[PDB]
Structures are given as C-alpha cells and as structure tokens.
C-alpha cells in the first residue's frame, strides 16, 4: 500500500537546485596513499557542492535526504592498565556523506524533464 | 562468466510500458506524524501506480521484478503468563514495494531510445 | 569532508568508452532450471561486454571500479570420518560481477552530456 503523504509530482525549484549540482570523477585519498595512481577512478557527486547549490537556490540538501551529515568525539589512546598500549584511537573530525539513490532518483527526474525540453 | 541466459536487448513494449510510469516526491506517513511537516522529501517511483500502467499495455510488472508484494498474518497482542502485557503485535496487513535498482536500470534504458529519439 | 583527490570532471575517453556499453534484458541461469520461462527478466549491463568496449577504446574497466572479478579453489567432496556424505561442494570457477552504483553514476554523466548535445 501507500505508507505515503504529502504525495506530488517532483518540486521545480528541487529539480532546478539539483540541475545545479556537477558529476566528479576522484580517487579516495585513502586508497591513493595506499596504493598510489594504483588507485581506481570512482564517479559521483560531492555532497559539500551539493549542499551549496541548493543553498543558492535557497533550499537545504538535507530535506530531501540527498545528504548526510556525521560529527565526532576525539576517543583516547589507551595504555592500560599499565603504561602499554592496546588501541590508538580517534582525533575529533566530522563528515559529509551522500544518500546515493536519492540522489539517482532526482537525477532521472531531472532527465527526464529536460527530454520533454523544459530544459 | 555468465550464469544468463533468455539474453537479449530490451523489449519495446517493457519500455513501452516504463515509460509509462511517473516520478513522485513524497513524505512517509510514519516520519510526518513523528517530526511534523519537519519531515524530509523523498523522490521516487510508486509501485502500485507501476502495478498499473504494465497492466494497461497488457504486462506484468512482478515478470520484470520491478515491484514486490508481501503480505501478513495478525500477530496476537500478549500477556503472559499473567493479565500482564509484553508486547503488542501486528494486525494483519499487506504491502508493495518496489526493486529500485532494476528501475532505475530500466529507467536508464528508457532514456537511452529517446535520445537515439526513437522517442 | 573531501577524503577526495585526483578530483576533476568525468575523463571523456572514459565517457566515451561507456557509451559503448550496451543494455540487456536476460534471465538467470539459475532461475530458468527452477521455474522454467515462469522466471523474470532483469534488466541491465553485462560485465564481460564492458571489459571489451573500454579495451577497444584502450582502457581498463577494473582501473574505474565498473567491473570485478573473482576466482576459486575446487573444494573436496567430504565423506567423513566414514565413507558417508556430509557435504558436496565447489568445482572451481571464476565469474565476473558489476558494481552497479558506480556503473549508474557513469550512465548518467554520460546521458548528462549528449543532453548538452556534446552526443
Ligand atoms: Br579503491
Ligand atoms: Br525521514
Ligand atoms: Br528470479
């Protein structure tokens, strides 16, 4: 059934927000110092950019659930119960992520608008 | 290797039928009465309207594993082994769902023949 | 955070590679000796043709993270401690397998493009 509501066709500012937002090719910083240029190409959007183009249309990325935000507490290394050292741990950081089939969704809706040629 | 078989392109009157389908935004009934109107956008498709325009061109949606269905039997509410209660359980329902990665796959192919603009 | 590097839009020789790719509708194997032509058809890309499209246009498929691979020993068929049956395991295979989020995001940039009217 329909465990739906506020149901309608896809916001025109939305899909004009999201027109906005760029495709990126990058390498993880993680894999890279692994493995240098060794490292594989991934393709995708950049949640920080995304953020930012729906902000100048006026709307938040995080209302449609396109974007994920994520914060930290720094953890202690621990010596226990003497001066040794069992586990190194973590320095505060915080993160931003992406809700990649959202994100998919609104971009074969965006698409499919453009077909029509309404852009 | 491949473990397929039936292997071919995309029937036409498949696409035919996607193409058919339309794109939503929506807010899900459980987060709209938890948050209020606080509650984010989702985008998607709907399955029971996908149900339906396959069945228009004469097609079954569940062949193509687009969509899903899944029902229930009423669980009993229980107080054991006193008057007392420890859970309270399910009344009988049912439910459709959708496969998103094979939509946006037949999706994706959709918009691949318009832009040869065979539509 | 950008835990991002080697950043920069989509390469075109890739785009270029991908739009080689073709779309399939198939049935499993797997299924097909199940349940007969009573099993579904999916829809989507076929690794081993994509290995090959972006080998033609001079490229690694692997180097992008659109296709894997995978390999096996041949497991014994274990009588034990007797000559009783307990289990009959693997002939040794390999197979090829997609990573369908990136192979998306790929499609999509790509149908970003020729809407620019750059294909
Ligand atoms: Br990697
Ligand atoms: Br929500
Ligand atoms: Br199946």
Redesign the interface.
């Known amino acids: 059934?329909?465990?739906?509501?506020?149901?309608?066709?896809?916001?025109d500012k939305?899909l004009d927000a999201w027109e906005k937002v760029?495709?990126?090719?990058?390498?993880?910083?993680?894999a890279?110092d692994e493995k240098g240029?060794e490292?594989?190409?991934?393709?995708?959007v950049?949640a920080?950019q995304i953020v930012k183009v729906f902000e100048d249309e006026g709307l938040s990325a995080?209302?449609?659930?396109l974007v994920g935000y994520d914060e930290w507490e720094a953890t202690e290394d621990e010596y226990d119960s003497e001066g040794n050292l069992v586990e190194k741990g973590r320095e505060a950081?915080?993160?931003?992520s992406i809700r990649?089939?959202?994100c998919?969704?609104?971009?074969?809706?965006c698409?499919?608008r453009?077909?029509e040629r309404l852009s």
Chains 1, 2, 3 share one sequence.
């Open positions: 059934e329909r465990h739906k509501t506020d149901i309608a066709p896809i916001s939305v760029k495709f990126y090719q990058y390498k993880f910083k993680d890279v240029e490292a594989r190409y991934h393709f995708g950049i920080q995080f209302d449609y659930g950081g915080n993160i931003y990649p089939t959202e998919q969704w609104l971009e074969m809706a698409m499919r453009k077909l």
